[PDB]
Amino acid sequence: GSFVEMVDNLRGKSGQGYYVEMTVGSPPQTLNILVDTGSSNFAVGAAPHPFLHRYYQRQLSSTYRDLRKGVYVPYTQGKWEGELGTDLVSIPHGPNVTVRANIAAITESDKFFINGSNWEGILGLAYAEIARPDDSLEPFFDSLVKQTHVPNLFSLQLCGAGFPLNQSEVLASVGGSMIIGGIDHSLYTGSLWYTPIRREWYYEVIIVRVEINGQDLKMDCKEYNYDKSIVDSGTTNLRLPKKVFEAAVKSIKAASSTEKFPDGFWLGEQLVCWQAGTTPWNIFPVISLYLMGEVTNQSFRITILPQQYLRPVEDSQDDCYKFAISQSSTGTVMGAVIMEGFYVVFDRARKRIGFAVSACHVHDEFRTAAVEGPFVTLDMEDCGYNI
Numbered sequence: 001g002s003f004v005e006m007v008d009n010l011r012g013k014s015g016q017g018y019y020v021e022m023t024v025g026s027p028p029q030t031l032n033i034l035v036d037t038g039s040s041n042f043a044v045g046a047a048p049h050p051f052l053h054r055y056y057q058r059q060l061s062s063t064y065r066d067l068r069k070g071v072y073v074p075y076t077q078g079k080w081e082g083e084l085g086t087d088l089v090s091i092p093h094g095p096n097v098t099v100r101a102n103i104a105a106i107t108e109s110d111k112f113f114i115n116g117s118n119w120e121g122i123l124g125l126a127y128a129e130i131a132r133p134d135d136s137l138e139p140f141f142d143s144l145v146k147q148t149h150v151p152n153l154f155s156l157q158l159c160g161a162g163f164p165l166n167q168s169e170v171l172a173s174v175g176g177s178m179i180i181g182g183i184d185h186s187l188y189t190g191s192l193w194y195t196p197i198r199r200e201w202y203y204e205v206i207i208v209r210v211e212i213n214g215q216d217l218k219m220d221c222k223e224y225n226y227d228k229s230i231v232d233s234g235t236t237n238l239r240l241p242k243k244v245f246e247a248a249v250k251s252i253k254a255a256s257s258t259e260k261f262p263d264g265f266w267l268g269e270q271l272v273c274w275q276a277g278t279t280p281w282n283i284f285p286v287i288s289l290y291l292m293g294e295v296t297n298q299s300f301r302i303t304i305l306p307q308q309y310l311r312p313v314e315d316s317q318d319d320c321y322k323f324a325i326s327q328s329s330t331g332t333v334m335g336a337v338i339m340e341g342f343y344v345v346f347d348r349a350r351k352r353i354g355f356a357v358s359a360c361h362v363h364d365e366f367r368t369a370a371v372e373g374p375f376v377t378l379d380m381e382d383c384g385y386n387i
């Protein structure tokens with residue numbers, strides 16, 4: 001329905017992440033926490049770091065409980081290590097509840113804390129299967145549902161500004177909404193379409209067709225989900241498996257061929273600039289991803305614009321962007337620049353993810369993002385990867 005207390009509770013941007021305010025401990029210690037659907041640990045800075053202006057001080061919390069256990073988390077782009085414990089946790093612009101949750105108190109880290117991101121921790125919203133050190137460490141959302149009457153569902157509206165925000169603007173700007181326990185109808189237009197959650201670990205989905213400006217990429221659909229496809233608010237880009245990326249970039253270059261861009265642009269490294277207000281959106285194609293539907297032999301599609309996959313960056317008065325589609329060796333990742341086009345419902349209770357056109361997606365007067373269906377699609381189970 002309407003969840004006014006939770007609307008506009010996020011801040012941030014696709015490149016540095018979107019975060020929500022939380023409190024930990026007694027008396028409450030306020031921290032800004034990255035919303036990460038990629039993930040399943042609640043982990044906070046708990047020791048001084050050059051990029052943190054605040055951190056969780058366990059010795060100042062009367063409700064802190066030491067689990068006497070360490071946690072070491074090395075991932076591809078970074079790492080952190082910490083100490084496990086529990087404490088009382090709240091979301092000020094959330095449900096009016098306080099829960100006893102696991103907290104990984106980060107004591108050492110490498111390339112984890114982003115300089116100027118304004119967040120001091122991460123809220124992993126995915127399932128216990130991928131929690132560290134193992135699946136016995138109950139994720140935050142599981143604790144929230146178990147201890148309260150909050151429904152087993154959350155929804156995210158990530159709002160890209162469509163232009164760069166400076167340090168002061170990004171702190172003063174509304175970055176979107178995280179609705180805990182419900183769906184807020186003001187955040188989207190049109191209908192919600194649902195795709196099954198294939199398996200509960202990451203938020204895994206199945207893509208069954210890909211089009212660039214209505215032209216079928218025509219790959220075996222298993223390629224689109226090799227080795228998985230996930231919905232991840234903690235990734236900036238739309239990431240595609242190597243072969244799919246190679247085919248998609250060739251098609252995007254062909255559609256936009258009236259302007260030649262350097263190789264560094266297509267690699268997502270180099271910015272491209274245009275005179276203020278002259279970005280030629282119309283030369284870039286729309287991209288549609290068809291997702292398995294809830295009805296047998298039915299699919300639907302989500303369509304994004306270049307206003308989603310060209311990420312605004314500062315250079316001058318020029319309008320500059322980076323290409324926010326990139327290669328992956330770990331499957332498709334529907335990151336923040338995809339999520340910025342849609343209101344996304346993580347319906348854990350019904351094992352499904354819903355998509356609707358976001359009320360805050362960036363567009364022009366000629367084209368809009370879309371969520372449309374149904375389409376008749378056969379043998380969709382064959383699109384999923386096994387082994």
Ligand SMILES: CSc1nc(N2C[C@H]3C(=O)N(C)C(=N)N[C@@]3(c3ccc(C#N)s3)C2)nc(C)c1F
Nearest residue numbers: 016017036038039041073075130132232234235
């Ligand atoms: C690979 S297993 C694993 N991974 C993570 N993360 C992976 C990071 C990762 O590359 N992405 C893509 C992720 N969605 N989340 C992580 C982030 C770190 C910093 C972020 C920002 N901004 S997002 C945490 N955290 C934990 C606790 C893990 F078990």
